Design a protein around this ligand. Structure first.
Ligand SMILES: [Zn+2]
Ligand SMILES: [Zn+2]
Ligand SMILES: [Zn+2]
Ligand SMILES: [Zn+2]
Ligand SMILES: [Zn+2]
Ligand SMILES: [Zn+2]
Lengths: 382, 383
């Protein structure tokens, strides 16, 4: 097969190690990346902005792997009104290129972020190229010139390719506050001692020296970025995600694999969908509104196929991006199409990363599922 | 300055007592409403009752917590609902309590219902328990159930679901309490495993076992069938259950009643539904969205569009006064024997009334300003 290292890309809310002692995004109380590396699969955990745009996260993710200083694009930065340059990274895989390829594995928004990254690698950014032409004084970063075939495969796990009908209700500021409650609780850590980093430096939202966590977070959660386009909230809506699908291409020389979960069941009378008992309480009510939410207008149309969900991502959204090539898994993995594995019943949105309160139907451990996922991308031919 | 009767605060659903979370109080959170009231000339007691028990159970426990004695839920009531008749034994926080040593009952959320239930039991007692005593004198009967006690000068409800919550109508209170404990521990900066939260469900044989983890215990509580029963907070909090309670929990003509209603919901221009405001605690955002768009033709009671505005967990039309009972909107004079409905407080969510962490108190610089005015307000009632 291949020897390409895996790179894990967290989704909305995701955090790096060193943010919670003893609690990892990938495994919770377990280290998945450690299990994969010990069992012979070189695996890297990448850390990008937990709540910024997929664009912001893809650029960050490039420099995280390759090494260098984050450049979000002069045109992008002007149009959306944040700083152009972000953090500086030494790179966890500097030799990354056409022959030293990598596998992108992304949970939740990380699947969108991975596709965004492949897009930027493959086709660059026309917008930034034109801005360079009009203003050669600004420069351009290699990531935006195009022509890099550095990603062998992209694997999404409960990724809202077509958005979330929860995100449509515009309560993600509220959701993330709640998330931060639940996350600190599950890490056994005091709210007052949290060093959770929202990574919104480009918007001038850095934690000030000696500033309390709660005052810093409130500065973030009241920021008007949450009503813009350059933010996770926007990208997670069904309109916003459909809009992204129009230009984040599915490339013919890349392997795409999708995994979808369902943790909802049809009510026999209402025909609505209700969360199962194993679901985390953070998603119980979200699942209930998603299980009962249909929308004729405005576009896109939300019909009854959208009612089943994993807690926060509808099943019909996680299988493949609408309009993109796709085949349900039939035993053979096809290149250049979305290979949609069968819905995994009983799996909630957080079960994929073994968040506390974990349930992994069909397996003894979240390790046994990642064993099969890693062996699967390892099997892809060169 | 009309009277000197002390204030007794009655927490609502999930409320905890001091000695369960050090540094974090039901009344005030990081502030101490009770301490502020006692330091500013208003004698105030904090009562503690079952966080998730029925209003009956809670009212009985409330009586003994103030008066002192051993909790007696009544032989008939314990027979029909299937739990132990005798609960905890208290020394009494106000033992001299009686017709001349009256108290003000100020209850938040379900605490307002519990306060009404206690006045009912004090005033009228229980006909069921008296008939049970007549048929079986061997069993005896507690003074609470004999009646005749005018020991409460006033009842003040804050964000009380007098007519129920359409949230409670969706049978998801188990999930809501599991989420609430997560938020409460977090607010209190305490790890889940080290919680000593007491559900106070002794009467159901649901005590925490020696050396039992908090998770194992809480799971025994949340998986119990009591939650689907007739004698639990979940039941009394439905619109049918509360409006049912309103038929026999009487608004007495010699008692002063005051109600406070919050609204933290706004009408949507397109749909006409109500949505939470940005200042709402995220624990209530989804509940608010559901309630702001929920109507019910059948089964009864009928839930029409007036129920859509809410504070996060209580509909505004539920919080003003119990249906059928005497009630007047506050007009500058406080009437005895009717529900004095103060103007809806815009911007106040359900937890703002008790300064839960992350609270805001529109119209005031802190929760101490509001309770200053509430306290001087019952203080002003004539003997
Ligand atoms: Zn940006
Ligand atoms: Zn929560
Ligand atoms: Zn789970
Ligand atoms: Zn009972
Ligand atoms: Zn009964
Ligand atoms: Zn609030």
């Amino acid at each position: 097969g291949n020897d390409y290292p895996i790179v894990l890309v967290h989704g909305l809310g995701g955090w790096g190690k060193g943010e919670f002692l003893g609690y990892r995004y990938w495994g919770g109380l377990k280290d998945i990346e450690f299990y994969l590396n010990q069992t012979g699969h070189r695996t890297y955990v990448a850390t990008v902005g937990p709540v910024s745009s997929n664009w912001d996260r893809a650029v960050e993710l490039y420099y995280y792997i390759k090494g260098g200083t984050v450049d979000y694009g002069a045109a992008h930065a002007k149009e959306h009104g944040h700083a152009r340059f972000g953090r500086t990274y030494p790179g966890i895989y500097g030799q990354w290129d056409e022959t030293n390829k990598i596998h992108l594995i992304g949970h939740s928004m990380g699947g969108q972020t991975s596709r965004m990254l492949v897009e930027l690698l493959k086709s660059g950014s026309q917008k930034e190229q034109e801005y360079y032409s009009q203003h050669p004084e600004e420069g351009i970063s290699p990531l935006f010139t195009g022509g890099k075939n550095w990603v062998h495969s992209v694997t999404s796990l409960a990724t809202p390719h077509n958005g979330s009908t929860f995100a449509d209700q515009e309560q993600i500021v509220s959701f993330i506050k709640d998330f931060i409650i639940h996350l600190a609780s599950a890490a056994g850590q005091k709210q007052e001692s949290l060093i959770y980093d929202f990574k919104l430096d480009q918007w001038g939202l850095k934690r000030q020296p000696g500033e309390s966590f709660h005052a810093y977070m409130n500065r973030v959660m009241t920021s008007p970025i949450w009503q813009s386009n350059d933010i996770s909230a926007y990208d997670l809506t069904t309109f916003g995600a459909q809009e992204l699908n129009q230009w984040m291409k599915t490339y013919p020389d890349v392997y795409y694999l999708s995994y979808t979960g369902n943790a909802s069941y049809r009510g026999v009378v209402t025909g609505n969908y209700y969360p199962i008992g194993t679901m985390h309480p953070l998603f119980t009510l979200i699942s209930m509104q998603m299980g009962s939410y249909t929308r004729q207008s405005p576009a896109p149309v939300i019909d009854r196929s959208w009612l089943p969900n994993d807690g926060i991502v509808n099943v019909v959204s996680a299988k493949y991006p609408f309009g993109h090539p796709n085949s349900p898994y039939d035993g053979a993995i096809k290149q250049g199409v979305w290979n949609s594995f069968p819905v995994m019943e009983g799996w909630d949105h957080m079960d994929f990363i073994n968040f506390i309160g974990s349930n992994t139907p069909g397996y003894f451990s979240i390790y046994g599922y990642y064993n099969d996922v890693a062996n699967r991308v390892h099997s892809l031919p060169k």
